[PDB]
């Protein structure tokens, strides 16, 4: 699960692999996929949803970064209009786009560094990479690659938007990044290995 580093640095290397004892990013991906599934199951008919179609992602779809598979697939009801790709913080959304029957999501954990504070940057980057790359399992053209900055508690997302999705997923991520169980476990492991008992 440990993302990467530079140089040898045995100290921070052992510190990071101690910060992730078991297969922990797999746990985070499962937890947040189920959290998004529950947030979708809360309002299914209101969003013209048909059924939660959580894809059989690979066992290491969360650690791999070259490809980008679909975390969950959403079946809309019928005549499901789409907005143009934008940001979660952008309010002036363009509702002029096609209409899709499928709609994919991909959660990508970004163990950022000081030169990776921009969460929306890496988000749209990985999104356009997975979209244009003709190598990834990729059923639907419309979707979102909502990312999360573990090492800075940052959140961002960019992709094809649903009708009334932006504030919905905004509140959902605000309530998921906070109060997450595995996120609390991350914070506990870090504060234990860091000696900042507050």
């Amino acid at each position: 699960t440990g993302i990467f580093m530079h140089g040898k640095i045995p100290t921070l290397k052992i510190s990071l692999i101690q910060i992730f004892r078991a297969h922990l990013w797999q746990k985070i991906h499962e937890s947040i996929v189920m959290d998004l599934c529950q947030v979708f199951d809360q309002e299914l008919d209101a969003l013209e949803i048909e059924t939660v179609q959580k894809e059989t992602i690979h066992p290491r779809k969360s650690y791999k970064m070259n490809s980008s598979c679909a975390d969950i697939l959403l079946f809309a009801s019928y005549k499901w209009n789409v907005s143009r790709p934008s940001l979660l913080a952008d309010s002036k959304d363009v509702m002029d786009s096609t209409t899709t029957q499928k709609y994919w999501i991909d959660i990508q954990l970004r163990w950022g560094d000081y030169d990776s504070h921009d969460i929306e940057r890496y988000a749209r980057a990985k999104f356009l990479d997975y979209t244009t790359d003709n190598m990834s399992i990729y059923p639907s053209p419309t979707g979102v690659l909502i990312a999360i900055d573990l090492a800075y508690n940052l959140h961002s997302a960019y992709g094809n938007w649903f009708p009334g999705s932006k504030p919905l997923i905004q509140q959902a991520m605000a309530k998921i990044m906070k109060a997450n169980p595995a996120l609390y476990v991350l914070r506990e492991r870090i504060r234990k290995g860091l000696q900042l008992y507050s």
């Binding site: 990776s116 940057r121 749209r124 980057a125 356009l128 990479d129 790359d133």
Partner: peptide, 11 residues
């Protein structure tokens, strides 16, 4: 890195 993604996009 791809031939259309910008430079400041990856930052």
């Amino acid at each position: 890195f791809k031939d259309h993604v910008s430079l400041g996009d990856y930052e």
